[PDB]
Design a protein around this ligand. Structure first.
Ligand code: NCZ
Length: 113
C-alpha cells in the first residue's frame, strides 16, 4: 500500500546519479539488498554490480536508503552467468531491494520520467 522503494528523481538515466530512495510500506522492519536489477541480456534478469547495498525499512516499512543510480556498469544474469552491458540505457533498470524469499516485488524502473 505504497510506492515502496523509489528514487527521489525519475530520470535515473544519469551518470551514476546519487539520490535518496524512500521505501514506503517496504520491509516492515525487515532488511534486504538494495540495487537496480532488470533484464540486461535478452530478457535475462541481470542485476547491476552496484545493486548490492543492504537496506532496512523501519517497522513502518520505511526504507529510506540513499544510493547512486549507476545505469552504466557490468550486469550479471540472475541465472548464474554474467553479462555486463556497461550501459543499462536500453533495458529499464528497476531500482529496488531483493527479498530473501526469491521474489522481486520491489523495483522502480528508473531512467526517464
Ligand atoms: C525482478 O526485479 C528485480 C528487482 C530488484 C530490485 C532486484 C534486486 C536484486 C536482485 O538480485 C534482483 C534479482 O535477482 O531478481 C530475482 C531474485 O532471485 C528474486 C526474484 C527474481 O527472480 C532484483 C530483481
Amino acid at each position: 500500500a505504497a510506492p515502496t522503494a523509489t528514487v527521489t528523481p525519475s530520470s535515473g538515466l544519469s551518470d551514476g546519479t546519487v539520490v535518496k530512495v524512500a521505501g514506503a510500506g517496504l520491509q516492515a522492519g525487515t532488511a534486504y539488498d538494495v540495487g537496480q536489477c532488470a533484464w540486461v541480456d535478452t530478457g535475462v534478469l541481470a542485476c547491476n554490480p552496484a545493486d548490492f547495498s543492504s537496506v532496512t525499512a523501519d517497522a513502518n516499512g520505511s526504507a529510506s536508503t540513499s544510493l547512486t543510480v549507476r545505469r552504466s556498469f557490468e550486469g550479471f544474469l540472475f541465472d548464474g552467468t554474467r553479462w555486463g552491458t556497461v550501459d543499462c540505457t536500453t533495458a529499464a533498470c528497476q531500482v529496488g531491494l531483493s527479498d530473501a524469499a526469491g521474489n522481486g516485488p520491489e523495483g522502480v524502473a528508473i531512467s526517464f520520467n
